[PDB]
Amino acid sequence: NPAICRYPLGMSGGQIPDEDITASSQWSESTAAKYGRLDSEEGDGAWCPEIPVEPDDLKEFLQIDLHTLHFITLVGTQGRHAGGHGIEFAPMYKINYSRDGTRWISWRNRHGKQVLDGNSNPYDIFLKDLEPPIVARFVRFIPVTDHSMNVCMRVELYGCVWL
Amino acid sequence: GPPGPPGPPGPRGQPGVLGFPGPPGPPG
Amino acid sequence: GPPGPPGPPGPRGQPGVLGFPGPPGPPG
Amino acid sequence: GPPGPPGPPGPRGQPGVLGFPGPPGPP
């Protein structure tokens, strides 16, 4: 199934409109949620929280509304390249998702681990398979750090429409 | 009739890009 | 009369926002 | 005649100021 259900869902291509991308906070209008699209250089290069992310206080998030239920098999993330001088990225992150938009589900891999290893630099696209895959309308990327740091993220969701 | 005067100045340019990230902090 | 020529370029945009704080200092 | 059309948009603003130094290294 994951062989056919592996298509980018709209972050890089624009299929997912700006209005459907929101966040917990933003450093500036130029780093608002809508700029958190994989490989984009628009605005100041990515979505970036207003304050540093602390290791014991995971309160930031980048939220995508797909409107209809989708099967999400992989996710991709990047930091903020910004023409070559950006240094911000999320080293790790968690994925929360929802069907109704009211109750949130914490994604856990087959071993019960919620934290996914992320980027190690601001420019490379890093992909992660989701096993088990998720069915959701809303997907949230929650940056996770091991020390206080100013993160930024550009992302993409891969999968297909449900039913 | 005489040509009209030159048009008015154009719109203001777009905001500049973000400043570079600051330098590394001091030693612990 | 005929329209005047195009106006001149507008003013430069506002400066970009301040950059992010630098990375943590190294062990000391 | 009427005034000519408005001029083209102005050049983009200058780069923002460099960020502040990072926090101190670990204690």
Residue numbers in the entry:
A (entry chain A): 26 to 188
B (entry chain B), C (entry chain C): 4 to 31
D (entry chain D): 4 to 30
Authors' account:
The discoidin domain receptors, DDR1 and DDR2, are widely expressed receptor tyrosine kinases that are activated by triple-helical collagen. Binding of triple-helical collagen to DDRs results in slow and sustained receptor phosphorylation (Shrivastava et al., 1997; Vogel et al., 1997), ultimately regulating many aspects of cell proliferation, adhesion, and migration, as well as remodeling of the extracellular matrix (Vogel et al., 2006). Structurally, the DDRs are characterized by an extracellular region consisting of a discoidin (DS) domain that is followed by a domain unique to DDRs, a transmembrane helix, a large cytoplamic juxtamembrane region, and, finally, a C-terminal kinase domain. The major DDR2-binding site in collagens I–III is a GVMGFO motif (O is hydroxyproline) that also binds the matricellular protein SPARC.
Diffraction data to 1.6 Å resolution were collected using synchrotron radiation and the structure of the DDR2 DS-collagen peptide complex was solved by molecular replacement. The DDR2 DS domain is an eight-stranded β-barrel arranged in two antiparallel β sheets (Ichikawa et al., 2007). At the top of the barrel, five protruding loops (L1–L3 connecting β1 to β2, L4 connecting β3 to β4, and L6 connecting β7 to β8) create a trench that accommodates the collagen peptide; the disulfide bridge between Cys73 and Cys177 lies at the bottom of this trench. The DDR2 DS domain interacts with two of the three GVNleGFO motifs in the C-terminal part of the 80 Å–long collagen peptide, burying 530 Å2 of solvent-accessible collagen surface with good shape complementarity (surface complementarity score, 0.71; program SC) (CCP4, 1994). In the DDR2 DS-collagen structure, the leading and middle chains of the collagen peptide (for a definition, see Emsley et al., 2000) account for 40% and 60% of the interface, respectively; the trailing chain is not involved in DDR2 binding. The central feature of the DDR2-collagen interface is an amphiphilic pocket at the top of the DS domain that accommodates Nle21 (leading chain) and Phe23 (middle chain) (for consistency we use the same numbering scheme for the collagen peptide as in our previous work on SPARC; Hohenester et al., 2008). One wall and the floor of the pocket are essentially apolar (Trp52, Thr56, and Cys73-Cys177 disulfide bridge), whereas the other wall is dominated by three charged residues (Asp69, Arg105, and Glu113) interacting with a string of water molecules. A salt bridge between Arg105 and Glu113 forms two hydrogen bonds with the hydroxyl group of Hyp24 (leading chain) and contacts one edge of the phenyl ring of Phe23 (middle chain), suggestive of a C-H⋯π hydrogen bond (Brandl et al., 2001). A comparison of our complex structure with the NMR ensemble of the free DS domain shows that collagen binding leads to a restructuring of loops L1 (bearing the critical Trp52) and L4 (bearing at its base Arg105 and Glu113).
